Design a protein around this ligand. Structure first.
Ligand SMILES: CCCCCCCC/C=C\CCCCCCCC(=O)OC[C@H](COP(=O)(O)OCCN)OC(=O)CCCCCCC/C=C\CCCCCCCC
Ligand SMILES: CCCCCCCC/C=C\CCCCCCCC(=O)OC[C@H](COP(=O)(O)OCCN)OC(=O)CCCCCCC/C=C\CCCCCCCC
Ligand code: HEC
Ligand code: HEM
Ligand code: HEM
Ligand SMILES: CCCCCCCCO[C@@H]1O[C@H](CO)[C@@H](O)[C@H](O)[C@H]1O
Ligand SMILES: CCCCCCCCO[C@@H]1O[C@H](CO)[C@@H](O)[C@H](O)[C@H]1O
Ligand SMILES: CCCCCCCCO[C@@H]1O[C@H](CO)[C@@H](O)[C@H](O)[C@H]1O
Ligand code: FES
Ligand code: FES
Lengths: 80, 241, 70, 147, 61, 380, 98, 48
């Protein structure tokens, strides 16, 4: 029994309509997308950074590894 | 680490997620294997019956297996003996044991080719590159007696001598047996030996997506439909203030 | 032819070798080979250059080779 | 979707490819000499295919054995004349009969006696039923496919 | 109006809803399979055994 | 006794109080979908697993080919094998998000639910580890040989404990068998423990993104979440199938298509992706013993999270500082994973140690510290 | 009782009789002449037992202990100058030497 | 198996050397004979 002993609530009215009197996915452009963007903006500068900062490290570490595999002509310049 | 050359990406006719194997090319490949590779390479997991409905007719298959003698037994006296193959037999091993194999190939051991395109990074693209790609060693590099230089094989010194050369065999379908044609067909065949489900698997993937896209959309609408009750719900605080 | 047997491979290999990056690489290889062959006490080898070449040539071949095969 | 996944998984339990591959054997009728009995391996057990000469559908098809131990009427579950195909297994203790000997010129199970005639029927012996007759087909005379 | 009709004859009575789901499935299977198989094959013309079979199917030796 | 049977019946009552009339916050997000997926994920492994077990043979001389013969001869054997194999990754992918979600929303504050959780993870690891040896391929064998030998570094009782586990002197047939046994067993223990997990969970009820009491607005699990989860099931299941069906071995080492051979060590013996991150921390500490402990700690560290919560708030929804720190840590794990996949040479070796250091620093020092600082900035 | 049943069950997992039987091998040196290397099967891997002559034991002393990747003199290895026993496995990647 | 039951380790080592067993393959992949060890099982009288 969890429904009835949850909280002491007073004076809050709510209104809702049957699923059949309303649209499932409404106001896609007027409300939906604008918020998708909103949400996307609020976070990019929190998430993106360390992920981008990861990529770099990956790229560097990768390229450097390959570089150290290449030969340096300065080891054979005086091997007549 | 160490230096290595990576094969390129050839546009195999079966690279497309929705693209199947060209069974004609596979059928050729089987010949290439049968008439060239099978000489040193074992293909333990494939059986003549496997060809039926894929590259050959039940009849051709029955024939192809009778071309071989297998070892059955024992008989009434407990002796072993020979008999002409049945479609239930698996492609004949070239050597009794690995020790014997190494012995006839300079201590090198030609690996069973049943899963080779999945046992090597690059699969066909690699196997194909390797085959056609033999050449002379660059300056400063010396290949020890018995090995052959191949830049595509790690270490570049491979125990396998170039196995295929122009017209080394004749496709009975009337296809110009240029060395690359061969490698190409055989590689195509190796793909198939490695995983016969290839075509069926992809045909299923198609069905899976279509249903998937259909079922997802539907359940999205249903999910939204139920939730709408909450999503639009409006409330207010009305104390007797 | 009017009837001989040619492997489209060798043909497309020739055609690709006359390509900018192949040439540039092929060049650096010849030099390496030349100076490595002309010496009697160098540790050097020309693998790296050979690869840069093969890699460039072969990448090119792949793009076309299968067009000519059955 | 459900129907398919279940069908697939369910059928993942029935006979596999390698097993269906030994399901049936095809015997060439036109290479079997008269009278002489030949045995092949089918489903891990001996399969008898004998060619009846001239004194088989006679000497062992006219036999007057009033009360039988197994209702054996060649028109019930058999067919071809000079051809008799049986499962080389005795219905006593699962032993394999022989073609050379036979009190009734048929087969003899060296385990406890069981004598079978030329048509493969228990005569003198402890084995109850008669050697089993497996399913078959004749969509090509010079070829029979048991199984 | 199908939606209206559909609702009345098919979706209103739980028992008929079920009957629709079944017969609906039976027909959907039959058509979805045939269609997909069709699409898969066109996408792979001349590569499948189904396609080259004729060459050895009563045309050799 | 009572009006409707759903509540009176000693069993329906159970199904009801945890899947139908169960109080769920109204604002839980997609990140809460992982519980159900993990559950489904489990039921699925066990199903495909049994199906594969009914064709497997646990013997060095037959394992490899039993698996092969299954994919090659058993109707849809190939499909089941794939589904099972890839299913394991889908499993971990899910568990890693499940955990993540927990960390970012301070779910761990539900100590017992959390602690059983860590136990589920550990169990799943053992399970997936032993599972991987079963096909007896090069990597199967070799990985088993390197990973299990690790314990030999434990003082005094080291070697003994390993040779015991192996059932001999090296990974051989007696190991393959006891692993198959373990692999069949553990999954069921997972199922059992999952019941405990949800049992503790239900004491408090779910947590929610805003981290504040949701009693003022709860909703019946059904249809809201039954539907939401069934949706999240198909949304993930698509990529799983897409992979499992179009790019089957996208995640597997090709070295495992070669029957185990004790006379050929592969060039780079590494465990499955979902383990790399720790394999990485293992090699960071040069010293067979320290590295093991570091490994152990890399996962056992989860048991401390609850005691390192200093914020006056539960989630990080309103803690931007903690948020970048959180995404840093994630990125950090990504790198560790990457390092684990590469050889032991410069510049990897150093990056490794760096990432391994930042890993423990973030969880042990930064997080609780930035947490406290955040409280002062709120005037708390 | 408990201690016993547990001990019994616990030990039911350690090496079985058949395995302990291959635990250690005894090689007869009389079968190995000087100047010739012989290999035996021990724990699934080749076991090298070579009879070194007083000659190779000397070429062994002219070995620059600080000019090797793994610094060890014949001192830190063999027990009898004429006898060298090794595990026929290359330290690189599991191959058997020649 | 006899050791510590009916015979001494020594007697046992002997009893097994009285038999030749089939081991292999060798460097050339051939089978070959050798004098038994206590690890061998009582010889079979017939091949099959
Ligand atoms: C060829 C096929 C022939 C074989 C026939 C077998 C199929 C028989 C199915 C019986 C029909 C079901 C009857 C449903 C009646 C109950 C009901 O109310 O509908 C379900 C009810 C809908 O509620 P309302 O829209 O409000 O209904 C109002 C009714 N006036 O609940 C639902 O949402 C259920 C339907 C959605 C199913 C979602 C499942 C998604 C899963 C996908 C993964 C793939 C499957 C793999 C299975 C794994 C097995 C190992
Ligand atoms: C461990 C082994 C390492 C393997 C790596 C695992 C796979 C990693 C894939 C990268 C994850 C991509 C996730 C992208 C989601 C980004 C996003 O939407 O961020 C914004 C969004 C905003 O949150 P609120 O503040 O509540 O806003 C409310 C307003 N409506 O943040 C979130 O969704 C919460 C974060 C939950 C996801 C965490 C998943 C990362 C998983 C990695 C494991 C980490 C934990 C430690 C494991 C130890 C073993
Ligand atoms: C004369 C025997 C012989 C023939 C014929 C031969 N091979 Fe080989 N093959 C070998 C040997 C030897 C090796 C082992 C090389 C090594 O490991 O050093 C080998 C190895 C291979 C490998 C790659 C091994 C690796 O580690 O990457 C492939 C793939 C291969 N062969 C393909 C073929 C194909 C396809 C054919 C037929 C066109 C063929 N071989 C014909 C002997 C042969
Ligand atoms: C066999 C693996 C597991 C299963 C099947 C499982 C299942 C679940 C389920 C069904 C839920 C409820 C729905 C949800 O919030 O996702 C849940 C919640 C939770 N699980 Fe797990 N879990 C598993 C592993 C773990 C692990 C590894 C941890 C963490 C170390 C964990 C921590 C939690 C916690 C804290 C909650 C509370 C969620 C909240 O914040 O409301 N679980 N788990
Ligand atoms: C807890 C869920 C499970 C996980 C995470 C899991 C994981 C694995 C893994 C990673 C493998 C190796 C797959 C490969 O690459 O070949 C595997 C194989 C196997 N698992 Fe599981 N498994 C689980 C449960 C089960 C169960 C319950 C059974 C059946 C009782 C089972 C039976 C097997 C068998 C027979 C194999 C060997 C065949 C093969 O390799 O495909 N698994 N499992
Ligand atoms: C190629 O296609 C496959 O061929 C199989 C027959 O070999 C069928 O059983 C599969 O359903 C089909 O997809
Ligand atoms: C998300 C649910 C995805 C389920 C998709 C069902 C598709 C599997 O369908 C399969 O297609 C094959 C190709 O013709 C057939 O040979 C199989 O018999 C059939 O079961
Ligand atoms: C006779 O040998 C017996 O072998 C047993 C091993 O099973 C030991 O436990 C006994 O102590 C020993 O006497
Ligand atoms: S089994 Fe044939 S006589 Fe007994
Ligand atoms: S030289 Fe590489 S394993 Fe011996």
């Amino acid at each position: 029994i969890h429904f009835g002993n949850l909280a002491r609530v007073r004076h809050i009215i709510t209104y809702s309509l049957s699923p059949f009197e309303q649209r499932a996915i409404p106001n896609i452009f007027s409300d939906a997308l604008p918020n998708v963007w909103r949400r996307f903006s609020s976070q990019v500068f929190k998430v993106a950074p360390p992920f981008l900062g990861a990529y770099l490290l990956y790229s560097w570490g990768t390229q450097e590894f390959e570089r150290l595999k290449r030969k340096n002509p300065a080891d054979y310049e005086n091997d007549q | 680490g160490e230096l290595e050359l990576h094969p390129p990406a050839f546009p195999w006719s079966h690279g497309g997620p929705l693209s199947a194997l060209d069974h004609s090319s596979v059928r050729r490949g089987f010949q290439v294997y049968k008439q060239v590779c099978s000489a040193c390479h074992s293909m333990d997991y494939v059986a003549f019956r496997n060809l039926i409905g894929v590259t050959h007719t039940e009849a051709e298959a029955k024939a192809l297996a009778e071309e071989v003698e297998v070892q059955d037994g024992p008989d009434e006296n407990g002796e072993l003996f020979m008999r002409p193959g049945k479609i239930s037999d698996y492609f004949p091993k070239p050597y009794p044991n690995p020790e014997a194999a190494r012995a006839a190939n300079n201590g090198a051991l030609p690996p069973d080719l049943s899963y080779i395109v999945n046992a090597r990074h690059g699969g066909e693209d690699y196997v194909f590159s390797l085959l056609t790609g033999y050449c002379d060693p660059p300056a400063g590099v010396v290949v020890r007696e018995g090995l052959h230089y191949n830049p595509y094989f790690p270490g570049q010194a491979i125990g396998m001598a170039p196995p295929i050369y122009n017209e080394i065999l004749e496709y009975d379908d009337g296809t110009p047996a240029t060395m690359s044609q061969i490698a190409k067909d055989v590689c195509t065949f190796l793909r198939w030996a490695a995983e016969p489900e290839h075509d069926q698997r992809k045909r299923m993937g198609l069905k899976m997506l279509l249903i998937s896209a259909l079922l997802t959309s539907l359940l999205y609408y249903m999910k939204r439909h139920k939730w709408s009750v909450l999503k639009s719900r409006k409330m207010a605080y009305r104390p007797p203030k | 032819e009017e009837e001989e047997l040619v492997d489209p491979l060798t043909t497309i290999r020739e055609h690709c070798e006359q390509t900018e990056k192949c040439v540039k690489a092929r060049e650096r290889l010849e030099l390496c080979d030349a100076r490595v062959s002309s010496r009697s006490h160098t540790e050097e080898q020309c693998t790296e250059e050979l690869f840069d070449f093969l890699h460039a040539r072969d990448h090119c071949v792949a793009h076309k080779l299968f067009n000519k095969l059955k | 979707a459900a129907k398919n996944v279940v069908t697939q998984f369910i059928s993942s339990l029935s006979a596999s490819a390698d097993v269906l591959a030994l399901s049936k054997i095809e015997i060439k009728l036109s290479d079997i000499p008269e009278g002489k009995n030949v045995a092949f391996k089918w489903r891990g057990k001996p399969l008898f295919v004998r060619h009846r000469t001239q004194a088989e559908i006679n000497q062992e098809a006219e036999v007057d054995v009033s009360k039988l131990r197994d209702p054996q009427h060649d028109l019930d579950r058999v067919k071809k004349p000079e051809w008799v195909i049986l499962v080389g297994v005795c219905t006593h203790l699962g032993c394999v009969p022989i073609a050379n000997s036979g009190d009734f010129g048929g087969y003899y199970c060296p385990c406890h006696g069981s004598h079978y005639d030329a048509s493969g029927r228990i005569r003198k012996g402890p084995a109850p039923y008669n050697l089993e007759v497996p399913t078959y087909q004749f969509v090509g005379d010079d070829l029979v496919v048991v199984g | 109006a199908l939606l209206r009709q559909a609702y009345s004859a098919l979706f209103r009575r739980t028992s008929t809803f079920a009957l629709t789901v079944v017969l609906g499935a039976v027909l959907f299977e039959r058509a979805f399979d045939q269609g997909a198989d069709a699409i898969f094959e066109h996408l792979n013309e001349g590569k499948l055994w189904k396609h080259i079979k004729h060459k050895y199917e009563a045309s050799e030796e | 006794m009572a009006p409707n049977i759903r509540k009176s019946h000693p069993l329906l009552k159970m199904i009801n109080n945890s899947l139908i009339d169960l109080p769920a916050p109204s604002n839980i997000s997609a990140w809460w979908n992982f519980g159900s997926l993990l559950a489904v994920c489990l039921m699925t492994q066990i199903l495909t697993g049994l199906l594969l077990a009914m064709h497997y043979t646990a013997d060095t001389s037959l394992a490899f080919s039993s698996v092969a013969h299954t994919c090659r001869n058993v109707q849809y054997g190939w499909l089941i094998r794939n589904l099972h194999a890839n299913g394991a990754s889908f499993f971990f992918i899910c568990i890693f998000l499940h955990i993540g979600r927990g960390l970012y929303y301070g779910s761990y504050l539900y100590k017992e639910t959390w602690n059983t959780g860590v136990i589920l993870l550990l169990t799943l690891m053992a399970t997936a580890f032993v599972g991987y040896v079963l096909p007896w391929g090069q990597m199967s064998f070799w990985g088993a040989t390197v990973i299990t030998n690790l314990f030999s570094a434990i003082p005094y009782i080291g070697h003994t404990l390993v040779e015991w586990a192996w059932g001999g002197f090296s990974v051989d047939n007696p190991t393959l068998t006891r692993f198959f046994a373990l692999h069949f067993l553990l999954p069921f223990a997972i199922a059992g423990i999952t019941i405990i997990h949800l049992t503790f969970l239900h004491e408090s009820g779910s947590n929610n993104p805003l981290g504040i009491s949701s009693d003022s607005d709860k909703i019946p699990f059904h249809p809201y979440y039954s539907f939401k989860d069934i949706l999240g099931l198909t949304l993930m299941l698509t990529p799983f199938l897409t992979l499992a069906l179009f790019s089957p071995n996208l995640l597997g080492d090709p070295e495992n298509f070669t029957p185990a051979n004790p006379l050929v060590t592969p060039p780079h013996i590494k465990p499955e992706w979902y383990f790399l991150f720790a394999y990485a921390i293992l090699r960071s500490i040069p010293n067979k013993l320290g590295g093991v402990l570091a490994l152990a700690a890399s996962v056992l560290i989860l048991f401390l999270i609850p005691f390192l919560h200093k914020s006056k708030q539960r989630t990080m929804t309103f803690r931007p500082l903690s948020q970048t720190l959180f995404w840093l840590l994630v990125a950090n794990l990504l790198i560790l994973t990457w390092i684990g996949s590469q050889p032991v040479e410069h510049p990897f070796i150093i990056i490794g140690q760096m990432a391994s250091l930042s890993y423990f620093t973030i969880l042990l020092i930064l997080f609780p510290t930035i947490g406290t600082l955040e409280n002062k900035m709120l005037n708390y």
